[PDB]
Design an enzyme around this catalytic site. Sequence first.
Site, PDB file in Angstrom:
ATOM      1  N   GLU A 127      24.462  50.899  18.393  1.00  9.22           N
ATOM      2  CA  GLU A 127      23.488  51.265  17.352  1.00  9.22           C
ATOM      3  C   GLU A 127      22.217  50.404  17.361  1.00  9.22           C
ATOM      4  O   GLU A 127      21.711  49.999  16.316  1.00  9.22           O
ATOM      5  CB  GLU A 127      24.125  51.306  15.967  1.00  9.22           C
ATOM      6  N   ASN A 179      26.430  52.391  22.955  1.00 14.98           N
ATOM      7  CA  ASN A 179      26.948  53.419  22.047  1.00 14.98           C
ATOM      8  C   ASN A 179      25.998  53.681  20.885  1.00 14.98           C
ATOM      9  O   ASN A 179      25.377  52.742  20.377  1.00 14.98           O
ATOM     10  CB  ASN A 179      28.310  52.931  21.518  1.00 14.98           C
ATOM     11  N   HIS A 215      29.360  62.107  15.551  1.00 16.02           N
ATOM     12  CA  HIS A 215      29.695  62.408  14.171  1.00 16.02           C
ATOM     13  C   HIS A 215      28.907  63.645  13.755  1.00 16.02           C
ATOM     14  O   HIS A 215      27.798  63.538  13.254  1.00 16.02           O
ATOM     15  CB  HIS A 215      29.347  61.209  13.299  1.00 16.02           C
ATOM     16  N   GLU A 246      33.431  58.644  19.064  1.00 17.48           N
ATOM     17  CA  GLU A 246      33.807  58.627  17.648  1.00 17.48           C
ATOM     18  C   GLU A 246      33.777  60.029  17.048  1.00 17.48           C
ATOM     19  O   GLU A 246      33.338  60.215  15.917  1.00 17.48           O
ATOM     20  CB  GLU A 246      32.894  57.696  16.831  1.00 17.48           C
ATOM     21  N   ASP A 248      34.177  63.319  15.173  1.00 16.46           N
ATOM     22  CA  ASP A 248      34.747  63.919  13.987  1.00 16.46           C
ATOM     23  C   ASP A 248      33.800  65.028  13.544  1.00 16.46           C
ATOM     24  O   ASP A 248      32.649  65.080  13.969  1.00 16.46           O
ATOM     25  CB  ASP A 248      35.099  62.896  12.885  1.00 16.46           C
TER      26      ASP A 248
END
Length: 346
Positions: A127, A179, A215, A246, A248
């Site tokens: 990030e 990432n 996400h 990650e 979802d």
Amino acid sequence: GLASLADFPIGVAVAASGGNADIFTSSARQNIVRAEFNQITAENIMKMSYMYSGSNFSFTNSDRLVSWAAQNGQTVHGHALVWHPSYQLPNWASDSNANFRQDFARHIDTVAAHFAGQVKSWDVVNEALFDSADDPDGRGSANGYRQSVFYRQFGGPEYIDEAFRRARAADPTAELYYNDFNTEENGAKTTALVNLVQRLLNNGVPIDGVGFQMHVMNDYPSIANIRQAMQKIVALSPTLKIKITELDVRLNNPYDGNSSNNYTNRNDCAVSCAGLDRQKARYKEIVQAYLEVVPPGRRGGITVWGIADPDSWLYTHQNLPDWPLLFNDNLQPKPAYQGVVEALSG
Ligand SMILES: [Ca+2]
């Protein structure tokens, strides 16, 4: 299970901080991990400050998790060597610390060396890109970079280069990832990712791959944009790996200007709803896009961000309920799970 259907890692984020999701205390979750996955990411306990107890390094709890993984058929993706949120900054990671660069070097050197042979890959920097959605101090963009304490101390993005170089030197065997989130939108942040990665490549930095957190929501961003964003990064190098780190999938979209297509009650998708069926198709199309545009031999893995819905950081978001993962509250596989099966199997 899922992992059997692929030759690249199929992973899951695991909790280890108490409560119902904690992998050490939940046999049902242990059984799902062993049956379905072949990699774990620590959801929380490998963040930066967790490497210390008081002012000294302490690997007790993370060692326990990494050992559990090795005993239960799982590799480990390390999350993360460098990340900005104040809640997990080591106390040395402060603008008030004259010894910052030395303490930064010591952090990476020590943690990466400690886990050598035990951790397959790392989020080396997580990030680093600016995101207005995620700028609570109002610092703003520096040509697309987040002005975290690392950026401020180093006077620029060189902290990223350094982190990768030190991680490589400390554990030559680990696959090293950059990432980030919202980079699948194919908008401004994707362009900033291209700039970030191209600069590292131009500088000869030992970056092995890029992680897309993914996400996403059921209907945003478009699969065409997700696909093109990944393509843009694949195009930067003949060898750079791509990993979904990650994943979802939120049924609810708060930000679509439509408050009439929101599921507002926990019972709405307890048994069946259009959203769970779309979620199957959504997981499916994302995994398919990954396969189509990331070459064989450059697939670093697909990981979902938790086991069961009530474990999800997005079980509630914006004061709304959601059901983001592959297993439900009773730990039964959802249509989402079948979407992954169908994609991975072709
Ligand atoms: Ca909506």
